[PDB]
């Protein structure tokens, strides 16, 4: 209504960006051929945080044709090409009187109405991007975004004092985001070390001391071992005839293999529970069977006897992966020594390792890629800022 795009706190007002900007000028550095100037092009900007980080000092003689807009301390420069990339930055004082590409719209705050830092953060918002119509679907001969298009966008305008307060809150919030990323990185490192340390303790070299009552056994003693075989070609089908067939490591998923092809003549069978292990090319890699299935040349299946927990075996094989990864013969597998606690202690220790393993996995995923996390979290902060909610 009278409220504009959305309702602002008391005392704020809606204006076009241009209404709080000043005129800007151009200069041809080639007119002082022996004079160095500093040039800010698109490549000079880190779009993730909106900072001029790599401008180039250039001899006037060699000024690029786009090098014509004079920038001043506190200007915001806003690329009119691909605006969604956020090549948008605040000009520091060291760059006063230097030059940026004509590809930037130069937004110079009229300090009677707007703080440069407030304009900078405002201009990084999707709220501005989303107003630039020439960025949306284009028909024949539609012009690209112009400087006037940018100056014409609507912006919420608090009093100067509140602008400065909002700038401080936005910058502090963004710094906390960085702090958390660093912390996560540290946790990832320490948690991985924890897992590695825990496995090394419970899985000592054969013959090493084990708590009384544990025994060193050969896997063959507490595990049925089945070497996979290639059935006759022509017994494979996709009609669900027989059992899913897994040739080798390639046919393994994150934890369990997913059925792709069947074999009507199941030769070597693995059941739910059994651990699958690659005995071929990438030796030692592991999965667990979740369905009755059959295995080929590339796999062995290990079926724990009653004195051995599936997951104790799995952790051990994973811990041994570097050794196992130098084919693998039945006798090899049967001859592997494993320390064997009573079932209750295997389960107690597996519960502990499971907690760490889940934490390592979570920490791995919780670290989002940098450019995306920073740009989209920035946007969520700006949305709060420009509604008056900070």
Author numbering: 1 to 326, 335 to 398
Please quote the paper that reports this structure.
Restriction-modification (R-M) systems maintain the integrity of bacterial genomes by cleaving foreign DNA. Type I R-M enzymes are composed of three different subunits: a specificity subunit (HsdS or S) that recognizes specific DNA sequences, a methylation subunit (HsdM or M) that methylates target adenine bases, and a restriction subunit (HsdR or R) that translocates from the recognition site and cleaves DNA at variable positions. The HsdS subunit consists of two globular domains that correspond to the variable target recognition domains (TRD1 and TRD2) and two conserved regions (CR1 and CR2) that separate the TRDs. M2S1 is also the core DNA-binding component of the R-M enzyme. Together, the M2S1 complex recognizes an asymmetric, bipartite nucleotide target containing two specific regions 3 to 5 bp in length that are separated by nonspecific DNA sequences of 6 to 8 bp.
We report here the crystal structure of HsdS from Thermoanaerobacter tengcongensis in an open form conformation at 1.95 Å resolution. TRD1 and TRD2 exhibited very similar folds. In TTE-HsdS, the CRs were found to be composed of two long antiparallel α-helices, forming a coiled coils motif. The two helices were held together mainly by hydrophobic interactions and four hydrogen bonds. A three amino acid loop (Gln375–Glu377) is inserted in the CR2 α-helice. And there is a fifty degree bend in CR2. Although both TRD1 and TRD2 have similar folds in the three HsdS subunits, the overall domain orientation is quite different. Compared to the EcoKI-HsdS computational model, significant bending and twisting of the CRs in TTE-HsdS crystal structure enlarges the angle and distance between the TRDs and also shows a small range of rotation between the TRDs. In summary, the crystal structure of TTE-HsdS shows an open form domain-orientation. The potential open state model of the M2S1 complex was proposed based on the structure of TTE-HsdS.
